Amino acid sequence: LTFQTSSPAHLTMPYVMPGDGEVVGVGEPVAIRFDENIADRGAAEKAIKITTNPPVEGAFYWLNNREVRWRPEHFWKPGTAVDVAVNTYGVDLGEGMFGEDNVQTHFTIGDEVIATADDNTKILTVRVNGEVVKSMPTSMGKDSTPTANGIYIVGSRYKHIIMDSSTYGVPVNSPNGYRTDVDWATQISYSGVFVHSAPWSVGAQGHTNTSHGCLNVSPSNAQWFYDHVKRGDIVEVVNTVGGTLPGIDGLGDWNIPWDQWRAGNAK
Ligand SMILES: *C(=O)[C@@H]([C@@H]1N=C(C(=O)O)[C@@H](S[C@@H]2CN[C@H](C(=O)Nc3cccc(C(=O)O)c3)C2)[C@@H]1C)[C@@H](C)O
């Protein structure tokens, strides 16, 4: 260990996901987010060593100037072990900004869990290692506020959460504002798409889209989803009238074509 002198106004710390020792789904990218913008992305990439077992080819792609992602071309093979060494201590990351410390994470890939929300049937079907285990009626985004098609990575889950218009700039007492209690909410996009309990749309679920974009399901089915899906599992939306989820959403990584992802956006 060689010591590096430092200043609190020229240091940046990396933060790695997923957590050390976690079991995650086949869609989980390695994520390294810095608490500062990174001027020299190539220097950050050269300081990060990702190794996998069984070994698979992967590559870095930056979602923005703060966070880089690493993933293979296809979903992970279940049982894969992944080691992440972020060896940024003392590294010159550009513009007088230096890496504050090293971080090391290890994680493993669990079962393959892919839930397909098909707008033609209004059914969300969960497959585990290829086998259907659950079929849930759903109501997705109305035509004016559709659910985007594409591959979504499961993120955080909440027993209870408040959806509040103030966060998008719309006061609660506006014609378009809302303050909504939601149970059993599984996040699948940073943009705000959740699978969640929607008692108010149970008659439409399986029939017609009435949501602002979220995947409405019954209270019991939402609780089931909360219990059985984990960070890194996949939700694929198909056949809606929306476009495609943006690749740099935060959970939209798999919608970027591999040739573009692998080419990267550092150098
Ligand atoms: C489920 O539907 C889920 C929310 N509900 C949302 C909504 O009410 O629109 C969306 S938020 C997401 C952020 N980008 C788009 C969007 O167009 N937001 C928007 C809509 C109207 C006005 C404004 C504005 O002026 O700021 C922004 C959709 C998401 C699916 C939970 C949180 O209800």
Short mmCIF file of N, CA and C in Angstrom, two decimals, residues 64-191:
data_model
loop_
_atom_site.label_atom_id
_atom_site.label_comp_id
_atom_site.label_asym_id
_atom_site.label_seq_id
_atom_site.Cartn_x
_atom_site.Cartn_y
_atom_site.Cartn_z
N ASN A 64 -24.02 8.56 -17.73
CA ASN A 64 -23.85 10.01 -17.59
C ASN A 64 -22.43 10.20 -17.08
N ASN A 65 -22.08 11.42 -16.70
CA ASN A 65 -20.70 11.66 -16.30
C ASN A 65 -20.39 11.15 -14.90
N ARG A 66 -21.37 10.60 -14.19
CA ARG A 66 -21.17 10.15 -12.82
C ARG A 66 -21.14 8.64 -12.67
N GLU A 67 -21.72 7.90 -13.61
CA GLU A 67 -21.97 6.49 -13.37
C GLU A 67 -21.66 5.66 -14.61
N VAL A 68 -20.83 4.63 -14.43
CA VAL A 68 -20.50 3.71 -15.50
C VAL A 68 -21.10 2.36 -15.17
N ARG A 69 -21.47 1.63 -16.21
CA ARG A 69 -22.08 0.32 -16.10
C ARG A 69 -21.24 -0.70 -16.85
N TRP A 70 -21.25 -1.94 -16.38
CA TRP A 70 -20.56 -3.03 -17.08
C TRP A 70 -21.49 -4.23 -17.15
N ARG A 71 -21.62 -4.84 -18.32
CA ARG A 71 -22.49 -6.00 -18.47
C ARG A 71 -22.02 -6.84 -19.65
N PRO A 72 -22.43 -8.10 -19.71
CA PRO A 72 -22.22 -8.93 -20.90
C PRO A 72 -23.23 -8.59 -21.99
N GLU A 73 -23.05 -9.25 -23.14
CA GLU A 73 -23.93 -9.04 -24.28
C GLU A 73 -25.34 -9.56 -24.00
N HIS A 74 -25.43 -10.70 -23.34
CA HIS A 74 -26.70 -11.34 -23.01
C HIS A 74 -26.85 -11.43 -21.50
N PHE A 75 -28.07 -11.72 -21.06
CA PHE A 75 -28.33 -11.89 -19.63
C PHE A 75 -27.32 -12.87 -19.03
N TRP A 76 -26.97 -12.64 -17.76
CA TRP A 76 -26.03 -13.52 -17.07
C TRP A 76 -26.54 -14.95 -17.02
N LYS A 77 -25.61 -15.89 -17.06
CA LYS A 77 -25.93 -17.27 -16.74
C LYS A 77 -26.16 -17.43 -15.24
N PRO A 78 -27.27 -18.03 -14.81
CA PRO A 78 -27.46 -18.27 -13.38
C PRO A 78 -26.29 -19.01 -12.77
N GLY A 79 -25.96 -18.64 -11.53
CA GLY A 79 -24.85 -19.21 -10.81
C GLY A 79 -23.52 -18.53 -11.03
N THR A 80 -23.45 -17.57 -11.95
CA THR A 80 -22.20 -16.86 -12.21
C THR A 80 -21.78 -16.05 -10.99
N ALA A 81 -20.48 -16.10 -10.68
CA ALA A 81 -19.84 -15.31 -9.64
C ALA A 81 -19.10 -14.14 -10.26
N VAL A 82 -19.25 -12.95 -9.66
CA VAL A 82 -18.70 -11.73 -10.22
C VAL A 82 -17.90 -11.04 -9.14
N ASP A 83 -16.67 -10.66 -9.46
CA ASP A 83 -15.78 -9.93 -8.57
C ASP A 83 -15.47 -8.57 -9.18
N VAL A 84 -15.61 -7.52 -8.37
CA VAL A 84 -15.43 -6.14 -8.82
C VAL A 84 -14.36 -5.52 -7.95
N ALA A 85 -13.25 -5.10 -8.57
CA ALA A 85 -12.19 -4.38 -7.88
C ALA A 85 -12.12 -2.98 -8.48
N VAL A 86 -12.58 -1.98 -7.73
CA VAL A 86 -12.51 -0.59 -8.15
C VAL A 86 -11.25 -0.04 -7.51
N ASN A 87 -10.16 -0.02 -8.28
CA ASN A 87 -8.84 0.30 -7.74
C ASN A 87 -8.50 1.76 -8.04
N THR A 88 -9.35 2.64 -7.52
CA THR A 88 -9.29 4.06 -7.85
C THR A 88 -8.48 4.89 -6.86
N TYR A 89 -7.95 4.30 -5.78
CA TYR A 89 -7.19 5.07 -4.80
C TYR A 89 -6.01 5.77 -5.46
N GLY A 90 -6.00 7.10 -5.39
CA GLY A 90 -4.91 7.89 -5.93
C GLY A 90 -4.93 8.07 -7.42
N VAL A 91 -5.95 7.56 -8.11
CA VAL A 91 -5.99 7.63 -9.56
C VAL A 91 -6.41 9.03 -9.98
N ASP A 92 -5.70 9.58 -10.96
CA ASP A 92 -6.02 10.88 -11.53
C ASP A 92 -7.20 10.69 -12.48
N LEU A 93 -8.37 11.18 -12.07
CA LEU A 93 -9.58 11.06 -12.87
C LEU A 93 -9.87 12.31 -13.68
N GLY A 94 -8.91 13.21 -13.80
CA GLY A 94 -9.01 14.37 -14.66
C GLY A 94 -9.46 15.61 -13.91
N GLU A 95 -8.98 16.77 -14.37
CA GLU A 95 -9.35 18.06 -13.81
C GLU A 95 -9.03 18.15 -12.32
N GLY A 96 -7.88 17.60 -11.93
CA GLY A 96 -7.44 17.69 -10.55
C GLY A 96 -8.25 16.87 -9.57
N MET A 97 -9.07 15.95 -10.07
CA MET A 97 -9.93 15.11 -9.25
C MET A 97 -9.27 13.74 -9.09
N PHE A 98 -9.13 13.28 -7.85
CA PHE A 98 -8.44 12.04 -7.58
C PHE A 98 -9.35 11.05 -6.85
N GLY A 99 -9.16 9.77 -7.16
CA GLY A 99 -9.89 8.71 -6.49
C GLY A 99 -9.57 8.65 -5.02
N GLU A 100 -10.62 8.58 -4.19
CA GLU A 100 -10.43 8.69 -2.75
C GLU A 100 -10.07 7.37 -2.08
N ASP A 101 -10.44 6.24 -2.67
CA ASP A 101 -10.28 4.94 -2.04
C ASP A 101 -10.50 3.86 -3.09
N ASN A 102 -10.16 2.63 -2.71
CA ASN A 102 -10.51 1.44 -3.45
C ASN A 102 -11.80 0.86 -2.87
N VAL A 103 -12.54 0.14 -3.70
CA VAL A 103 -13.71 -0.59 -3.21
C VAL A 103 -13.71 -1.96 -3.86
N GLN A 104 -14.15 -2.97 -3.13
CA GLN A 104 -14.23 -4.32 -3.67
C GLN A 104 -15.59 -4.90 -3.34
N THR A 105 -16.23 -5.50 -4.34
CA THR A 105 -17.54 -6.13 -4.17
C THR A 105 -17.49 -7.50 -4.82
N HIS A 106 -18.26 -8.42 -4.26
CA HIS A 106 -18.47 -9.74 -4.84
C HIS A 106 -19.97 -9.98 -4.87
N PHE A 107 -20.48 -10.58 -5.95
CA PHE A 107 -21.88 -10.99 -5.93
C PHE A 107 -22.09 -12.20 -6.84
N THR A 108 -23.27 -12.81 -6.73
CA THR A 108 -23.62 -13.98 -7.53
C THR A 108 -24.96 -13.80 -8.22
N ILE A 109 -25.12 -14.49 -9.35
CA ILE A 109 -26.36 -14.46 -10.12
C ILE A 109 -27.26 -15.61 -9.68
N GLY A 110 -28.52 -15.30 -9.37
CA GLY A 110 -29.51 -16.29 -8.99
C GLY A 110 -30.27 -16.84 -10.18
N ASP A 111 -31.48 -17.33 -9.92
CA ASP A 111 -32.30 -17.91 -10.99
C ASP A 111 -32.64 -16.88 -12.06
N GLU A 112 -32.91 -17.38 -13.26
CA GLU A 112 -33.40 -16.54 -14.35
C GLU A 112 -34.88 -16.26 -14.15
N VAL A 113 -35.21 -14.99 -13.92
CA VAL A 113 -36.60 -14.56 -13.70
C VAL A 113 -36.91 -13.47 -14.71
N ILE A 114 -37.80 -13.77 -15.65
CA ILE A 114 -38.16 -12.85 -16.72
C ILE A 114 -39.68 -12.75 -16.74
N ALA A 115 -40.20 -11.55 -16.50
CA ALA A 115 -41.64 -11.31 -16.53
C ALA A 115 -41.96 -10.52 -17.78
N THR A 116 -42.89 -11.02 -18.59
CA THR A 116 -43.24 -10.38 -19.85
C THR A 116 -44.63 -9.78 -19.70
N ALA A 117 -44.73 -8.48 -19.90
CA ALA A 117 -46.00 -7.77 -19.88
C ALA A 117 -46.39 -7.54 -21.34
N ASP A 118 -47.40 -8.27 -21.80
CA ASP A 118 -47.77 -8.25 -23.21
C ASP A 118 -49.01 -7.38 -23.36
N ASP A 119 -48.87 -6.24 -24.04
CA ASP A 119 -50.01 -5.34 -24.17
C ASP A 119 -51.12 -5.92 -25.03
N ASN A 120 -50.84 -6.93 -25.85
CA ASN A 120 -51.92 -7.50 -26.66
C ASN A 120 -52.88 -8.32 -25.82
N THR A 121 -52.39 -8.97 -24.76
CA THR A 121 -53.24 -9.76 -23.87
C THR A 121 -53.53 -9.07 -22.55
N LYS A 122 -52.77 -8.03 -22.20
CA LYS A 122 -52.88 -7.39 -20.89
C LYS A 122 -52.60 -8.39 -19.77
N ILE A 123 -51.65 -9.30 -20.01
CA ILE A 123 -51.21 -10.28 -19.03
C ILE A 123 -49.71 -10.11 -18.82
N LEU A 124 -49.29 -10.14 -17.55
CA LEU A 124 -47.89 -10.17 -17.13
C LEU A 124 -47.58 -11.60 -16.71
N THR A 125 -46.72 -12.27 -17.45
CA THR A 125 -46.37 -13.67 -17.22
C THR A 125 -44.95 -13.76 -16.68
N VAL A 126 -44.78 -14.40 -15.53
CA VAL A 126 -43.47 -14.55 -14.89
C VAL A 126 -42.94 -15.95 -15.20
N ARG A 127 -41.76 -16.02 -15.81
CA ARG A 127 -41.09 -17.28 -16.09
C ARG A 127 -39.84 -17.36 -15.25
N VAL A 128 -39.65 -18.51 -14.60
CA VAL A 128 -38.46 -18.79 -13.80
C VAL A 128 -37.73 -19.94 -14.48
N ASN A 129 -36.50 -19.66 -14.94
CA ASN A 129 -35.71 -20.63 -15.69
C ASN A 129 -36.54 -21.27 -16.81
N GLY A 130 -37.32 -20.43 -17.49
CA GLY A 130 -38.10 -20.85 -18.65
C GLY A 130 -39.50 -21.34 -18.36
N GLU A 131 -39.85 -21.58 -17.11
CA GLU A 131 -41.14 -22.16 -16.74
C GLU A 131 -42.09 -21.07 -16.26
N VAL A 132 -43.32 -21.06 -16.78
CA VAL A 132 -44.32 -20.12 -16.27
C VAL A 132 -44.65 -20.50 -14.84
N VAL A 133 -44.56 -19.53 -13.93
CA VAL A 133 -44.96 -19.74 -12.55
C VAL A 133 -46.11 -18.83 -12.13
N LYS A 134 -46.39 -17.76 -12.87
CA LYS A 134 -47.45 -16.85 -12.49
C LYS A 134 -47.95 -16.09 -13.72
N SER A 135 -49.27 -15.88 -13.77
CA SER A 135 -49.92 -15.05 -14.79
C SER A 135 -50.80 -14.03 -14.08
N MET A 136 -50.55 -12.74 -14.32
CA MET A 136 -51.27 -11.65 -13.66
C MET A 136 -51.93 -10.72 -14.66
N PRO A 137 -53.24 -10.50 -14.59
CA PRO A 137 -53.82 -9.41 -15.37
C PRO A 137 -53.20 -8.07 -14.98
N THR A 138 -52.98 -7.20 -15.98
CA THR A 138 -52.38 -5.89 -15.74
C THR A 138 -53.11 -4.84 -16.56
N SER A 139 -53.02 -3.60 -16.08
CA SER A 139 -53.44 -2.41 -16.81
C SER A 139 -52.23 -1.50 -16.90
N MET A 140 -51.79 -1.21 -18.11
CA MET A 140 -50.60 -0.41 -18.36
C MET A 140 -51.02 1.02 -18.77
N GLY A 141 -50.06 1.78 -19.30
CA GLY A 141 -50.30 3.19 -19.57
C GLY A 141 -51.34 3.40 -20.66
N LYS A 142 -52.23 4.38 -20.42
CA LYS A 142 -53.17 4.81 -21.44
C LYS A 142 -52.42 5.25 -22.70
N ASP A 143 -53.17 5.36 -23.81
CA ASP A 143 -52.54 5.73 -25.07
C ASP A 143 -51.80 7.06 -24.99
N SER A 144 -52.31 8.01 -24.20
CA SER A 144 -51.66 9.31 -24.09
C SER A 144 -50.45 9.30 -23.16
N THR A 145 -50.33 8.28 -22.32
CA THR A 145 -49.22 8.13 -21.38
C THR A 145 -48.83 6.66 -21.37
N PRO A 146 -48.32 6.15 -22.48
CA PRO A 146 -48.14 4.70 -22.62
C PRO A 146 -46.93 4.20 -21.85
N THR A 147 -46.96 2.90 -21.57
CA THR A 147 -45.79 2.21 -21.05
C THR A 147 -44.83 1.93 -22.20
N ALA A 148 -43.57 2.34 -22.07
CA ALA A 148 -42.61 2.08 -23.13
C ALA A 148 -42.33 0.58 -23.25
N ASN A 149 -42.17 0.12 -24.50
CA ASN A 149 -41.69 -1.24 -24.73
C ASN A 149 -40.22 -1.35 -24.35
N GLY A 150 -39.79 -2.57 -24.06
CA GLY A 150 -38.36 -2.81 -23.91
C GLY A 150 -38.05 -3.64 -22.69
N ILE A 151 -36.75 -3.73 -22.40
CA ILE A 151 -36.26 -4.55 -21.30
C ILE A 151 -35.99 -3.62 -20.12
N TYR A 152 -36.61 -3.92 -18.99
CA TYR A 152 -36.49 -3.17 -17.74
C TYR A 152 -35.79 -4.06 -16.73
N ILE A 153 -34.84 -3.48 -15.98
CA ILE A 153 -34.18 -4.17 -14.87
C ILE A 153 -34.90 -3.83 -13.57
N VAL A 154 -35.22 -4.86 -12.78
CA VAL A 154 -35.85 -4.63 -11.48
C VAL A 154 -34.86 -3.95 -10.53
N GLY A 155 -35.32 -2.89 -9.87
CA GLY A 155 -34.53 -2.19 -8.87
C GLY A 155 -35.01 -2.44 -7.46
N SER A 156 -35.31 -1.36 -6.74
CA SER A 156 -35.73 -1.43 -5.35
C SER A 156 -37.20 -1.84 -5.23
N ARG A 157 -37.58 -2.31 -4.05
CA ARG A 157 -38.97 -2.68 -3.78
C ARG A 157 -39.42 -1.99 -2.50
N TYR A 158 -40.71 -1.67 -2.44
CA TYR A 158 -41.26 -0.89 -1.34
C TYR A 158 -42.58 -1.51 -0.91
N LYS A 159 -42.72 -1.80 0.39
CA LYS A 159 -44.03 -2.23 0.87
C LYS A 159 -45.05 -1.12 0.69
N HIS A 160 -44.63 0.12 0.90
CA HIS A 160 -45.51 1.27 0.76
C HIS A 160 -44.69 2.45 0.26
N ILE A 161 -45.27 3.23 -0.65
CA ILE A 161 -44.58 4.40 -1.18
C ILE A 161 -45.62 5.43 -1.58
N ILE A 162 -45.22 6.69 -1.56
CA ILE A 162 -46.09 7.79 -1.95
C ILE A 162 -45.60 8.31 -3.29
N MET A 163 -46.49 8.33 -4.28
CA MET A 163 -46.21 8.96 -5.56
C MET A 163 -46.76 10.38 -5.45
N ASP A 164 -45.90 11.38 -5.63
CA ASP A 164 -46.24 12.76 -5.30
C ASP A 164 -45.85 13.66 -6.45
N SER A 165 -46.83 14.39 -6.98
CA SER A 165 -46.62 15.24 -8.14
C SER A 165 -45.57 16.32 -7.89
N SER A 166 -45.41 16.76 -6.63
CA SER A 166 -44.46 17.84 -6.36
C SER A 166 -43.08 17.50 -6.89
N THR A 167 -42.74 16.22 -6.95
CA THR A 167 -41.43 15.79 -7.44
C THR A 167 -41.27 15.97 -8.94
N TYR A 168 -42.36 16.05 -9.70
CA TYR A 168 -42.24 16.36 -11.12
C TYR A 168 -42.64 17.79 -11.43
N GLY A 169 -42.85 18.62 -10.41
CA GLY A 169 -43.10 20.03 -10.59
C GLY A 169 -44.56 20.42 -10.50
N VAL A 170 -45.45 19.44 -10.39
CA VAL A 170 -46.89 19.65 -10.42
C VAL A 170 -47.41 19.64 -8.97
N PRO A 171 -47.93 20.74 -8.45
CA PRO A 171 -48.46 20.73 -7.09
C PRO A 171 -49.58 19.71 -6.94
N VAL A 172 -49.77 19.24 -5.70
CA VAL A 172 -50.81 18.25 -5.45
C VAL A 172 -52.20 18.82 -5.73
N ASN A 173 -52.41 20.11 -5.46
CA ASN A 173 -53.68 20.78 -5.74
C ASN A 173 -53.71 21.42 -7.13
N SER A 174 -53.09 20.77 -8.13
CA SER A 174 -53.20 21.14 -9.56
C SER A 174 -54.20 20.18 -10.22
N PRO A 175 -54.73 20.55 -11.38
CA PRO A 175 -55.61 19.68 -12.14
C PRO A 175 -54.94 18.39 -12.52
N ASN A 176 -53.62 18.39 -12.65
CA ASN A 176 -52.87 17.19 -13.00
C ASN A 176 -51.99 16.68 -11.86
N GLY A 177 -52.14 17.20 -10.65
CA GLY A 177 -51.35 16.73 -9.54
C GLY A 177 -51.94 15.51 -8.87
N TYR A 178 -51.13 14.84 -8.06
CA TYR A 178 -51.62 13.69 -7.32
C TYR A 178 -50.70 13.41 -6.14
N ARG A 179 -51.29 12.87 -5.08
CA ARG A 179 -50.56 12.34 -3.93
C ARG A 179 -51.19 10.99 -3.64
N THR A 180 -50.49 9.93 -4.01
CA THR A 180 -51.05 8.59 -4.14
C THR A 180 -50.29 7.63 -3.25
N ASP A 181 -51.01 6.97 -2.35
CA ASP A 181 -50.48 5.85 -1.59
C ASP A 181 -50.45 4.61 -2.46
N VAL A 182 -49.32 3.91 -2.49
CA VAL A 182 -49.18 2.71 -3.31
C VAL A 182 -48.53 1.62 -2.48
N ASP A 183 -49.14 0.44 -2.48
CA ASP A 183 -48.64 -0.74 -1.78
C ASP A 183 -47.86 -1.63 -2.74
N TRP A 184 -46.86 -2.34 -2.20
CA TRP A 184 -46.19 -3.43 -2.90
C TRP A 184 -45.68 -2.98 -4.27
N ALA A 185 -44.76 -2.01 -4.24
CA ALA A 185 -44.29 -1.35 -5.46
C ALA A 185 -42.88 -1.83 -5.79
N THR A 186 -42.73 -2.42 -6.97
CA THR A 186 -41.41 -2.85 -7.45
C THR A 186 -40.97 -1.91 -8.57
N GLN A 187 -39.86 -1.21 -8.37
CA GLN A 187 -39.40 -0.22 -9.35
C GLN A 187 -38.73 -0.92 -10.52
N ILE A 188 -39.06 -0.50 -11.75
CA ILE A 188 -38.43 -1.06 -12.94
C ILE A 188 -37.87 0.00 -13.87
N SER A 189 -38.06 1.29 -13.59
CA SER A 189 -37.34 2.33 -14.32
C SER A 189 -37.06 3.49 -13.38
N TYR A 190 -35.91 4.15 -13.58
CA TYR A 190 -35.67 5.41 -12.87
C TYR A 190 -36.72 6.45 -13.22
N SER A 191 -37.24 6.42 -14.46
CA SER A 191 -38.27 7.37 -14.87
C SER A 191 -39.55 7.24 -14.04
#
